[PDB]
Each structure stands twice: as C-alpha cells, then as structure tokens.
Amino acid sequence: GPAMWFPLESNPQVMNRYISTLGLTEAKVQFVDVYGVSDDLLEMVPSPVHAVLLVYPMCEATDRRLAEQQAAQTAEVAALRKSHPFFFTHQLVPNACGTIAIAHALMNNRDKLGEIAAGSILDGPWAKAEDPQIIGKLIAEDTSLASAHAAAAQEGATIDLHFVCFIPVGGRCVELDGRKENPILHGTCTDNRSFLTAAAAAIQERVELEFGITALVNK
C-alpha cells in the first residue's frame, strides 16, 4: 500500500538506471561497488568518492551505540547545520530507505550530477524544498517517486536491513540515516581519501557486531 514500499537492493546497475529515471538525463556520476573496508579494497574505489552508501542489518548493539552518539552530539550537529549546510530528510515510509539514501547522496552533490530534466522527480516539489520531518513527509507522499522506487526495487529482485549514506561535511564523516532524529557524526577527515577511511572505519565497527557498500563516483 502507500505507506509500505518494496525494499530496494544494493545493486549499482539498478541504482544507476534508477537515478536516470529520477531525472538525471546525462548522469556524470554513477554508483559502483565497494568490495570491503580493508585498505586493499578501499584502494580499488575510484577517486573522488562523493558519498558512501551502506545497507546493513541492525543489531541492538549498533542501535545502542547510535543512541549514545546522538546524545553526545546534539550541540555539534546543530552547529554543523549552520556552518556547513547539508540536506537531511527523515524516512517516514518503511523500506523507502534505499531511495532516501540515494536522495541523500544526490542532493548533497547537486554540483556533480549533470542536468536535471525539467519536470522530473528530481525537479519535483520535495527536491526544491529546512526541517527533516517536512521534507520527509513530501518524499513519503510523492507518488511518482514511490512508483519509480517500486520499478527499481523489482529490477533488483529475484533481519531489519537499513540503508544509509555517508558524506563529508565540515571536516567530519557524516551518516545520514532517515530512521534517526539527527545526522550522526563519525570520524574527522581533511581530504576525500580520509573521508573514505572514516566511512570505512564506521562501517567496519558494525561488521564486527552481509553488508552492501557502494560509492557515488564520477562517470
């Protein structure tokens, strides 16, 4: 029904066709696989990385750690929203999280994307449109988005999984999880490579507690 979507699988080919359907007419970015979090595997990732996407199963331990990070970080997260503004939305619909993650990656990298087709989902009211609840509502309600998501999900088709997005913001590796109140702050970083290291370190901490990792890179 309207308020439960089919799950989108972590699959770069499916994701790349999807972002085309969302309105990227000639995408200058693409998703690729990240094969793991060792230095060896990270070296294989193209550079620069604009965003790291992760699908993972929640464990109570991981959820615990996140609660403590949220509680430790309220002040610094508020400061960062002002100092280095970024796009964050809540996820109001179950299983919308692959789309939220892709939205997070794209909308925090508009300068990289290429042309957005006039009239496309990415040109839509939510995309133009502050508060994560309000944006979240509009995304949850966009029937064009829901329909495109369904089609992408089906293309990939043949334990509480969550899909999230890591971006660099003001010298910090930031996790955008639409199922959390606030962005989560992880390691510090100074350049793009150290951001990838910081995202990988956050991921590796949960691996020890399977995972699908992708990266948004230039095409």
Residue numbers in the entry: -2 to 126, 131 to 159, 168 to 218, 224 to 233
What does the paper say about this structure?
Here, we have purified and characterised recombinant DUB16 from Leishmania donovani, which belongs to the Ub C-terminal hydrolase (UCH) family. DUB16 from L. donovani (Gene ID LdBPK_250190.1) is a 233 residue (25 kDa) protein that is predicted to comprise a single catalytic domain belonging to the UCH family. DUB16 efficiently hydrolyses C-terminal aminocoumarin and rhodamine conjugates of Ub consistent with proposed cellular roles of UCH-type DUBs in regenerating free monomeric Ub from small molecule Ub adducts arising from adventitious metabolic processes. With 100–1000-fold higher turnover rates, DUB16 cleaves the ubiquitin–ribosomal L40 fusion protein to give the mature products.
There are two molecules, A and B, in the asymmetric unit of the DUB16 crystals. DUB16 has a weight average molecular mass of 24.8 kDa. This compares with the mass of 25.5 kDa calculated from the sequence, and we conclude that the recombinant protein is a monomer. DUB16 comprises a single domain with an α/β fold assembled on a central six-stranded anti-parallel β-pleated sheet. The β−sheet, with a strand order β1−β6−β2−β3−β4−β5, is surrounded by α-helices, with helices α5 and α9 prominent in their close packing onto opposing faces of the sheet. The active site cysteine (Cys94) is located at the N-terminus of the buried helix α5, with its side chain at the base of a groove. From sequence alignments, the other catalytic residues are expected to be His171 and Asp186 which combine with Cys94 to form the catalytic triad and Gln88. In both the A and the B molecules of the structure of DUB16, the side chain of His171 adopts two conformations. In one of these conformers, the imidazole makes a potential ion-pairing interaction with the carboxylate of Asp169, and the cysteine thiol distances are ~7 Å suggesting that this structure does not represent an active state. In DUB16, it links helix α8 to strand β3, and in the A and B molecules of the asymmetric unit, this 12-residue segment is disordered with four and seven residues respectively missing from the electron density maps. Binding of the Ub moiety in DUB16 would require relatively small changes in (i) the conformation of the α9-β6 and α8-β3 loops to accommodate the C-terminal tail of Ub and (ii) the β1-α2 loop so that hydrophobic interactions with the β1-β2 loop of Ub may be formed.
